[PDB]
Design a protein around this ligand. Structure first.
Ligand SMILES: CCC(C)(C)[C@H]1C(O)=C(C2=CS(=O)(=O)c3cc(NS(C)(=O)=O)ccc3N2)C(=O)N1Cc1ccc(F)c(C)c1
Length: 557
């Protein structure tokens, strides 16, 4: 029952990997402690292999089967459709990994005969053969962090042809089934403004609230053959075309439950018997499995008025407190149940009696005040990793612009507004790239976004108050200041100064640019402009935003 077996062949790169922060003329204006920032490489892959390789044991009781029966009954109400080849081709990111079979993602998107013909052949094979393990490639992710040094995370994914077939069989299912099965507990249905409302409303609904986050140790490696067969039994409760059923069964037996791991040089690295990080069903499978195990563990622990919020492997629970000693004992029971279900913790969970000290999806609730002095809740995080990734992106073009996803999702925060907005609008002005669309990821899917659309995007995701917040909390302010000292980032007084310049430049461009100057940087001037609802906000097509999660899913929206 091991998560992986290995041959000793190395996990190899496909191009040169940099680990040191690249430096250019713009670097010092953001961050001086360059030696604090690094990127992960295949050189640490071996250390990750060791961490992710362990035996799983799993004891399944009546609570587990009781929840699973309920989830199944809800899933039975879902009707899901097959996508056409052309619809699935349109969901492929332009820069997705090319096929081993002589075509690329651009050929897929174009519906080129070589690509479409091969995809039809993979589909036929999937319908005919429900036994043969499907090949996957294993690679080390290159991700940027601040020291305090993580080994590379691994990514495991099938060929591009197979990925298009996954979409055809399962895109509609994984996009629709989780919210039906899980209701308000499915986290990927929420925009940031919706997510903070749900946490606060939930917290407020309890007489004496308690909450905690649950950190599963290497969630993907804890997912067993049982878990993945249970996921398929849930998918199969849906009302589906017979062709879709056969494809889902085949994909489950041949790809999702396990298969051979091949490096970038074509050598066999070993064999996987746990979740693949780079398949379409990674997010939905992890969310269903986490929810099943956590709901059952809640019943085992006798938690009172229990609300869960689940985004894949990310779990928070808010419930009724029963006193500090019994809460501590209940959380032990919960952790023991989870452990018996094959989901033991990394960090053991702690009860918290302050909403603002709970982290979920790498974020906590904090409070600031709008133009009328009215309290507004918003989600924030420690800015260290966002700012390290921004320093890197200041000197290197990358396929995903973390800075842009961070402005979008953390737009209300003092650090996104003062540092990220200022710094990157400066760069776009100087380079005359204000109109250039950039790719970034939200809930695992890729979006191409125009930075001049940012004000309307932010009004939709957060409301107009995102542009007037002030009087942020002392905890939040100190956590930012602490980060700036650590990374060597100029203090906020300098940022306010630069923001005025940036704002004046943007207003001097007219049009969409001036709207960015007006809304995004109203905080930097004492003589304020009046900020009214933006007409363009009402016409923005944000469909496909905040419907589901697609981590590893190879989705472009
Ligand atoms: C720029 C996007 C950002 C900030 C990273 C953004 C984002 O996209 C993810 C995010 C992306 S994801 O890849 O779908 C994913 C996968 C898994 N686990 S798994 C592998 O099992 O699916 C767990 C969590 C998760 N969350 C995230 O948590 N963000 C923070 C965040 C989230 C919600 C929110 F309201 C605010 C304000 C900020």
């Amino acid at each position: 029952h091991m998560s992986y077996t290995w041959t000793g062949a190395l996990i190899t790169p496909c191009a040169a990997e940099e680990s040191k922060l690249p430096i250019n003329a713009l670097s010092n204006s953001l961050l001086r402690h360059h030696n604090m920032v690094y990127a992960t490489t295949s050189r640490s892959a071996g250390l990750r292999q060791k961490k992710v390789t362990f035996d799983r044991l799993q004891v399944l009781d009546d609570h587990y089967r009781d929840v699973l029966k309920e989830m199944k009954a809800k899933a039975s109400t879902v009707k899901a459709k097959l996508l056409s080849v052309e619809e699935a081709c349109k969901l492929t990111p332009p820069h997705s990994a090319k096929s081993k079979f002589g075509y690329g993602a651009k050929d897929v998107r174009n519906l080129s005969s070589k690509a479409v013909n091969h995809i039809h052949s993979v589909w036929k094979d999937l319908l005919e053969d429900t036994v043969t393990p499907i090949d996957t490639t294993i690679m080390a992710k290159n991700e940027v962090f601040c020291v305090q040094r993580k080994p590379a995370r691994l990514i495991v994914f099938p060929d591009l042809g197979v990925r298009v077939c996954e979409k055809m069989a399962l895109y509609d299912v994984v996009s629709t089934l989780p919210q039906v099965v899980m209701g308000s507990s499915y986290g990927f249905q929420y925009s940031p403004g919706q997510r903070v409302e749900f946490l606060v409303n939930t917290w407020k609904s309890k007489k004496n609230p308690m909450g905690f986050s649950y950190d599963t140790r290497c969630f993907d490696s804890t997912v067993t053959e049982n878990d993945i067969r249970v996921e398929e039994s849930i998918y199969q409760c849906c009302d589906l075309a017979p062709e879709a059923r056969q494809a889902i069964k085949s994909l489950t037996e041949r790809l999702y439950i396990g298969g051979p791991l091949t490096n970038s040089k074509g050598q066999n690295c070993g064999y996987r018997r746990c979740r693949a990080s780079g398949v379409l069903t990674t997010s939905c499978g992890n969310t269903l499995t986490c929810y099943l195990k956590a709901s059952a563990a809640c019943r085992a622990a006798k938690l009172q008025d229990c609300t869960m919020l689940v985004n894949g492997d990310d779990l928070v629970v808010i419930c009724e407190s029963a006193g500090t000693q019994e809460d501590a004992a209940s959380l032990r029971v919960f952790t023991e149940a989870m452990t018996r279900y094959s989901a033991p913790p990394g960090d053991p969970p702690q009860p918290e009696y302050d909403l603002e000290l709970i982290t979920s999806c790498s974020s906590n609730v904090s409070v600031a005040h709008d133009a009328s002095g009215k309290r507004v809740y918003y989600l924030t995080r420690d800015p260290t990793t966002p700012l390290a990734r921004a320093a890197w992106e200041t000197a290197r073009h990358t396929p995903v612009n973390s800075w842009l996803g961070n402005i979008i999702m953390y737009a209300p925060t003092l650090w996104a507004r003062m540092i990220l907005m200022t710094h990157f609008f400066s760069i776009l002005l100087a380079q005359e790239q204000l109109e250039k669309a950039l790719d970034c990821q939200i809930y695992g899917a890729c979006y191409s976004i125009e930075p001049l659309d940012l004000p309307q995007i932010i009004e939709r995701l957060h409301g107009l108050s995102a542009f007037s917040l002030h009087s942020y909390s002392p905890g939040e302010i100190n956590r930012v200041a602490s980060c700036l000292r650590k990374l060597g980032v100029p203090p906020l007084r300098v940022w306010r100064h630069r923001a005025r310049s940036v704002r004046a430049r943007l207003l001097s461009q007219g049009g969409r640019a001036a709207t960015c100057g007006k809304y995004l940087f109203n905080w930097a001037v004492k003589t304020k402009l009046k900020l009214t609802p933006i007409p363009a906000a009402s016409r923005l097509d944000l469909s496909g935003w905040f419907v589901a999660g697609y981590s590893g899913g190879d989705i472009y929206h």
